[PDB]
C-alpha cells in the first residue's frame, strides 16, 4: 500500500504549490481501467539541496502523524514523490472568500476548534509546523478542515523545547512571532502566535484588502523584516475584524503576547473556543 508504483499513478491535473515543490491530482489505478482512488501527489521539480533535505523530513514527519485534522500521508513513489489524501474542496483561504455569504460565525468557530485540536496533537508529538496559515489549511467538507504543508515542519530537539533555524525566511513574515523574526527561534509558542493570525484570517474570511500583509504594510510605511519587528515590540497588532465576537478577539491578543510563556497553550485555547 505505502509503495506506490510510478506507472500506475495517472496524472489528472495540477492542484497547487506549498512552500516548496508542487502538488498534482492523480488517479492511482493499478488495474488500468480508471476505477482507482484520487490522490494528492507532491514532488520537487525545480529545487536545491536544502529543499530536498526538507522534503525527506516532511515525509517522515507526516507519515508518523495521526489525526482527523492533519492531512493523511498515504505513501511514497520512487524521482521521489509524496502521496497524500485528496480533499476535493481545496484550501480554506479560497473557500472562505468563495462562500462568505453562507458561512456564519459559528462555522468559523468550528474551523478554529478543529485547527486547535490538530495543533494540540502536533504539540504532543513535539513537532513545530513553522507555517500555520489559511493557505496551508485544507477543506474536506463544509464541517471539516485539516492542517497541511509540513515542508518547513521540525521536530524539537530531545533536550530542548525550541528550535533555532539557521535559514532566514522561507515563508511570509506576517505570521511570524517576534522571537522568530529577531532570533529565528521556533517553538509551540510561536505556532500559537500564528494561530492568532489564522483566527484573524477566518474572521475576515481571508479578505485580501484587510489581510495580515495588507494591514501591517500600511503600518510599516514608506528593511521590511526589521520594521515589522519594531511595530510588534512597540505593541502594534492586527485590529479587531469587522463584526468579530469580542471573546474571539481577546484570544487573538493572548496568542500575540510579547513573551512566549505568557501565550496560552493549545490545550487551554481549546475549551475557551468550544464554550462560546
Ligand atoms: C485547481 C485549484 O483550484 N487549485 C487550488 C489552488 C490552491 C489550492 C490548494 C489546495 C488544493 O487542493 C488540495 C487537495 N488535496 C490535497 N492534499 C494535499 C494537498 C496539498 O499539499 N496542497 C498544497 C498545494 C497546499 C497546502 C499548501 C492538497 N490540496 C487546491 C487548490
Q: Where are the domains of the chain?
A: 1-86, 87-276
Whose C-alpha lies nearest to ligand 1, atom 13? 90
Q: Can 131 be counted among the known catalytic residues?
A: yes
Distance CA 175, CA 169 (A): 11
* CB of residue 84 inside a 6 A radius of ligand 1: yes
Here the cell at position 53 is: 533535505
Place of cell 499513478: 9
Distance CA 147, CA 41 (A): 16
16 marked among binding-site residues? yes
Place of cell 535559514: 167
* Strand-pair category, 9-16 with 22-28: antiparallel
| Neighbouring-strand partners of residue 26 | 11, 39
* CB of residue 137 inside a 6 A radius of ligand 1: no
Which helix H or strand E contains 226, and what residues bound it? helix 224-234
Considering only CA atoms, which of 172, 176, 173, 193 is closest in space to residue 257?
Answer: 193
Considering only CA atoms, which of 149, 72, 144, 150 is closest in space to residue 113?
Answer: 144
* Strand-pair category, 81-85 with 137-141: unpaired
User: Residue 40: phi, psi to the nearest 5?
Assistant: -105, 120
Environment class of residue 141 by beta-carbon count within 10 Å: exposed (0-12), middle (13-18) or buried (19+)? Answer: exposed
Contact 244, 262 (CB under 8 A): no
| Annotated active-site residue in 33, 54, 68, 131 | 131
Whose C-alpha lies nearest to ligand 1, atom 23? 18
* Distant-in-sequence, close-in-space partners of 71: CB < 8 Å, separation ≥ 6: 40, 62, 84, 85, 87, 138, 146, 147, 148
Ligand 1 closest atom vs CA 40 = 17
How far CA 68 is from CA of 76, 118, 132, 184, in Å, comes to: 21, 8, 17, 30
* CB of residue 15 inside a 6 A radius of ligand 1: yes
* Strand-pair category, 154-155 with 163-164: unpaired
CA of 40 to the centre of ligand 1 (A): 8
Cα 229 → chain centroid = 22
How far CA 24 is from CA of 42, 163, 198, in Å, comes to: 6, 31, 26
Distance CA 251, CA 115 (A): 15
259 marked among binding-site residues? no
Here the cell at position 80 is: 521521489
Distance CA 19, CA 111 (A): 22
CA of 113 to the centre of ligand 1 (A): 21
Distance CA 44, CA 183 (A): 29
The one-character DSSP state at 275 is T
Distance CA 148, CA 134 (A): 10
Q: Is the dihedral of CA 262, 246, 96, 88 positive or negative?
A: positive
- The angle formed by the CA atoms of residues 1, 151 and 99, to the nearest 5 degrees, is 90
* Distant-in-sequence, close-in-space partners of 2: CB < 8 Å, separation ≥ 6: 74, 75, 76
Contact 208, 135 (CB under 8 A): no
Here the cell at position 14 is: 495540477
* CB of residue 206 inside a 6 A radius of ligand 1: no
CA of 184 to the centre of ligand 1 (A): 28
| Topology of the domain covering 1-86 | Phosphorylase Kinase; domain 1 (3.30.200)
Q: Which CATH number fits domain 87-276: 1.10.150.120, 1.10.510.10, 3.60.15.10, 3.90.640.10?
A: 1.10.510.10
Amino acid at each position: 500500500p505505502t509503495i506506490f508504483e510510478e506507472r500506475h499513478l495517472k496524472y489528472i491535473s495540477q492542484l497547487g504549490k506549498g512552500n516548496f515543490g508542487s502538488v498534482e491530482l492523480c488517479r492511482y489505478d493499478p488495474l488500468g481501467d480508471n476505477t482507482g482512488a484520487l490522490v494528492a501527489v507532491k514532488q520537487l521539480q525545480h529545487s536545491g539541496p536544502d529543499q530536498q533535505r526538507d522534503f525527506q523530513r516532511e515525509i517522515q514527519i507526516l507519515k508518523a502523524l495521526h489525526s482527523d485534522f492533519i492531512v493523511k500521508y498515504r505513501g511514497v513513489s520512487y524521482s521521489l514523490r509524496l502521496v497524500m489524501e485528496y480533499l476535493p474542496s481545496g484550501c480554506l483561504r479560497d473557500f472562505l472568500q468563495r462562500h462568505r455569504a453562507r458561512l456564519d460565525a459559528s462555522r468559523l468557530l468550528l474551523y478554529s476548534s478543529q485547527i486547535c485540536k490538530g495543533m494540540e496533537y502536533l504539540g504532543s508529538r513535539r513537532c513545530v509546523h513553522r507555517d500555520l496559515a489559511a493557505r496551508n489549511i485544507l477543506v474536506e467538507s463544509e464541517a471539516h478542515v485539516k492542517i497541511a504543508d509540513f515542508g518547513l515542519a521540525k521536530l524539537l530537539p530531545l533536550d530542548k523545547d525550541y528550535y533555532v533555524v539557521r535559514e532566514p525566511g522561507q515563508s511570509p513574515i506576517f505570521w511570524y512571532a517576534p522571537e522568530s523574526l529577531s532570533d529565528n527561534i521556533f517553538s509551540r509558542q510561536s505556532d500559537v502566535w500564528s494561530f492568532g493570525v489564522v483566527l484573524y484570517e477566518l474572521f475576515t474570511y481571508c479578505d485580501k484588502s484587510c489581510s495580515p500583509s495588507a494591514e501591517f504594510l500600511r503600518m510599516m510605511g514608506s528593511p521590511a523584516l526589521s520594521r515589522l519587528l519594531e511595530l510588534l515590540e512597540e505593541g502594534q497588532r492586527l485590529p479587531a475584524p469587522p463584526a468579530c465576537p469580542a471573546e474571539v478577539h481577546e484570544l487573538m491578543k493572548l496568542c500575540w503576547a510579547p513573551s512566549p510563556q505568557d501565550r496560552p497553550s493549545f490545550s487551554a485555547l481549546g475549551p475557551q473556543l468550544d464554550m462560546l
